């Protein structure tokens, strides 16, 4: 067993974190007070779930988690909510003033002042670990803290834990639920600074999740809560292999090996099915073939883009529920004859498959129906670069007039960092083009 520390940065990182840990407790049968009746080794152990949970002598199971926000009100809700007893007060870190939607403020001004304290609290969790494998980092691209503080933190984690893997769950900005007009600036700034420091990053476009909630959950105006219960299902699918017995994606290193052959091109597309409303009176349960086929529809992806017009470098299918290899292979053979799936010349055309027999757990009274089988596909496709193209175009529109740049310069950032960040993105868009056409 090798431990993983989760880091949740800013409002989005924190609230998604709440949702993920809520779900993890439900999956492993851990109660809000941290008791786990099924865990027969009281006070310690090296089961698969211990990757994410430490244990006290009293048998409290505590997340290997740090929550950080530059302002208190979001983490204050963790401090006083259903799961308040789960987390040690020292794991929940807040400043008094936020980054005001400004990367430069999150990274340079306010960040400089809280960084050592956060690293010290991270150090405290690391010291409790027999063999720390590394980090899962949750944040928005668009927030001042989520962008600014995260990129500084990432830089520092590379210095202090040079051998450790770092994975990201990243909320890409969507105008339907955006908070700031400068989110494109913050996204490009944070991506540039973080790129060398992250091994694998799972991007979730709030536009995709919003539309999935509208179309499949019949929610007219999805809230953050609706979005996050869905996101936490996808994260749980992704991390299940770290938390349960298995032979696929068992350590963080294996995520890079299996999904990322080119280190800069480290953004796998996640696709999830099925999403079914809990209020749907009559539902015909979907087969292995139907859910697997649904992994190739844009409407089910975490980022809206078109994989038919790019190439694949890798593909994992992660099933939960009543699924056996033979039905997977039969589904794959059919899908291959109907769909444009093209791999890059130097990679095998194939699928790594993982099955866990436990069907997905749903949050009681939540929006998602219980289903007999579900799948998360992780594909490293060049098509995801469509998202970088959209974001870069928005950046260029504002930056050609230097609209809002003064707010960043006023925090000590040089104007030059904007065009450096943007050049790196230009190079990234280029990399995807070379590999994919």
């Amino acid at each position: 067993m090798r431990e993983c520390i989760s880091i949740h940065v800013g409002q989005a990182g924190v609230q998604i974190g709440n949702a993920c840990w809520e779900l993890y407790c439900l999956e492993h049968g851990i109660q809000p007070d941290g008791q786990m009746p099924s865990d027969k080794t009281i006070g310690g152990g090296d089961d698969s779930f211990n990757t994410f949970f430490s244990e006290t002598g009293a048998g409290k199971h505590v997340p290997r988690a740090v929550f950080v926000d530059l302002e208190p009100t979001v983490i204050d809700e963790v401090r006083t909510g259903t799961y308040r007893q789960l987390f040690h007060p020292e794991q929940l870190i807040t400043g008094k003033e936020d980054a005001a939607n400004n990367y430069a403020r999150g990274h340079y001004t306010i960040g400089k002042e809280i960084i050592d304290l956060v690293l010290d609290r991270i150090r405290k969790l690391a010291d409790q670990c027999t063999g720390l494998q590394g980090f899962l980092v949750f944040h928005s691209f668009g927030g001042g803290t989520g962008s600014g503080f995260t990129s500084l933190l990432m830089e520092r984690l590379s210095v202090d834990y040079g051998k450790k893997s770092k994975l990201e769950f990243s909320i890409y900005p969507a105008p339907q639920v955006s908070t700031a007009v400068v989110e494109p600036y913050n996204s490009i700034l944070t991506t540039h600074t973080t790129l060398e420091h992250s091994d694998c990053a799972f991007m979730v476009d709030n536009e995709a999740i919003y539309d999935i909630c509208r179309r499949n959950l019949d929610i007219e105006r999805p809230t953050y809560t609706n979005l996050n219960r869905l996101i936490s299902q996808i994260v749980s699918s992704i991390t299940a292999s770290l938390r349960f017995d298995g032979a696929l994606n068992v350590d963080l290193t294996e995520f890079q090996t299996n999904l990322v052959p080119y280190p800069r091109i480290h953004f796998p597309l996640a696709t999830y099915a099925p999403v079914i409303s809990a209020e749907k009176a009559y539902h015909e349960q979907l087969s292995v073939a139907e859910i697997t086929n649904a992994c190739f529809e844009p409407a089910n992806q975490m980022v809206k883009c078109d994989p038919r017009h790019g190439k694949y470098m890798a593909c994992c299918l992660l099933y939960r529920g009543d699924v056996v290899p033979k039905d997977v292979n039969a589904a794959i053979a059919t899908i291959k004859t109907k769909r444009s799936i093209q791999f890059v010349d130097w990679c095998p055309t194939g699928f790594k498959v993982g099955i866990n027999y436990q069907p997905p757990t749903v949050v009681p009274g939540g929006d998602l129906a219980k289903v007999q089988r579900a799948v998360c596909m992780l594909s490293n496709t060049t098509a995801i670069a469509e998202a970088w193209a959209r974001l870069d175009h928005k950046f260029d529109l504002m930056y050609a007039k230097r609209a809002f740049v003064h707010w960043y310069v006023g925090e000590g950032m040089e104007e030059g960092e904007f065009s450096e960040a943007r050049e790196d993105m230009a190079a990234l868009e280029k990399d995807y083009e070379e590999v994919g056409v």
Binding site: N101, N102, S178, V181, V182, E220, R221, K401
Partner: protein
């Protein structure tokens, strides 16, 4: 950033200021004595922003009341909510400012300003995390205009990393006390351009026209003008005062609304437009709110929005309504009139909703626009300035207090620079 310190200066400043406190006190269920008597918990959640817990479960809204005359402040003290203000926060001289910016800024005001800064400091020292300041004043008099902008400069010196927000009442010949208003206003604008982060341009021309043409008041008083101001003021501070999705503050308002530091003069708007006492019984449909809030006749600055382009817009909808319909209507305005929104700021229109309606309405909309059409306001003031200035008329009132002509020449050029800066982005 949590606490805001509110300052009200001069006759206009204190009259709109008193009305603002009346209106928001009602919304937060606070009574003339400072005792809470409401039912909703949304009322108390962010009450710290303005109000401040005192002895025996009381609320003392961070407010400092400033004048060079005692008249209006005696009127505040005996007015409906007069008892609520902290007595030590009444800071007044005796001699007045005679509608003269030089008296407020250089002579009479200089004598009183340190006493105000002592009260400001005392209030700031109680703050966990002071966001900054909001000032209510007019630009056409002498105290709110001259002493108000002196205060701003001194507050910036002592708190250079805090936000400065004003509600600034612009003079109009249609509602005019003295011929020197354009002088006072031009001198003040020069200061506002340098030392505020955000300024709401409340145009007395527009308030008059709304009262006359729309509310059918044949003879608008200051009290009718102020009814519109306090409703707009309640509207624009909604997201600072009530918990929602946004958790807005003064800095985030500035970051998102102001692409270039000098272009920070906002055109506010309100719907539905209502008079005092007289109010209609049918609520508006969300399409009607949206149409009325964007209508030039609902704007509090006498500028034609079609004569320019919106750099940024913040829209607040208040009441119980379909958020889906709000989004659809807001998206519809942009998609239907896209040329009036600059294409080089993606998604430059942001909407927020609050369940709690203002008093006596089921549905309301408040509009905050950063439009390049605001240049019309400054051109108007500039034309009126030059008409007198070219003959140096009425200048002796100012040179008698030690000012030189050069200072008028500089303030005029800066305000003309501001105008051409708006023209730049209207075309580019």
């Amino acid at each position: 950033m949590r606490e805001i310190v509110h300052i009200q200066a001069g006759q206009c400043g204190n009259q709109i200021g008193a009305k603002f406190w009346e209106v928001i006190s009602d919304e937060h269920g606070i009574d003339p004595t400072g005792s809470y008597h409401g039912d909703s918990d949304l009322q108390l959640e962010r009450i710290n922003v303005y109000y401040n817990e005192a002895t025996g479960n009381k609320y003392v809204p961070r407010a400092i009341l400033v004048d060079l005359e005692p008249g209006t402040m005696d009127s505040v003290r005996s007015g409906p909510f007069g008892q609520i203000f902290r007595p030590d926060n009444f800071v007044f001289g005796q001699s007045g400012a005679g509608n003269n910016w030089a008296k407020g800024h250089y002579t009479e005001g200089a004598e009183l300003v340190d006493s105000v800064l002592d009260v400001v400091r005392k209030e700031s020292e109680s703050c966990d995390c002071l966001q900054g300041f909001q000032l209510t004043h007019s630009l056409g008099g002498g105290t709110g205009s001259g002493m108000g902008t002196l205060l701003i400069s001194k507050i910036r010196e002592e708190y250079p990393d805090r936000i400065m927000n004003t509600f600034s009442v612009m003079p109009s010949p249609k509602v005019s006390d003295t011929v020197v208003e354009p002088y006072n206003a031009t001198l003040s604008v020069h200061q506002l351009v340098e030392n505020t982060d955000e300024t709401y341009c409340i145009d007395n021309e527009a308030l008059y026209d709304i009262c006359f043409r729309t509310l059918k008041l044949t003879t608008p008083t200051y009290g009718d003008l102020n009814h519109l101001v306090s409703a707009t003021m309640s509207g624009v501070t909604t997201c600072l005062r009530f918990p929602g999705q946004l958790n807005a503050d003064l800095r985030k308002l500035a970051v998102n609304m102001v692409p270039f530091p000098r272009l920070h003069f906002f055109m506010p708007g309100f719907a539905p437009l209502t008079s005092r006492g007289s109010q209609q019984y049918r609520a508006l449909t969300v399409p009607e709110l949206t149409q009325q809030m964007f209508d030039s006749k609902n704007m509090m600055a006498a500028c034609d929005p079609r004569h320019g382009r919106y750099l940024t817009v913040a829209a607040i909808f208040r009441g119980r309504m379909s958020m889906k319909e709000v989004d659809e209507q807001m998206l519809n305005v942009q998609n239907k009139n896209s040329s009036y929104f600059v294409e080089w700021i993606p998604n430059n229109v942001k909407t927020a909703v609050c369940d709690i309606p203002p008093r006596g309405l089921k549905m309301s909309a408040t509009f905050i626009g950063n439009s390049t059409a605001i240049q019309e306001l400054f051109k108007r003031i500039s034309e009126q300035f030059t008409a007198m200035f070219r003959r140096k008329a009425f200048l002796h009132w100012y040179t008698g207090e030690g000012m030189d002509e050069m200072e008028f020449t500089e303030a005029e050029s800066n305000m003309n620079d501001l105008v051409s800066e708006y023209q730049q982005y209207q075309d580019a």
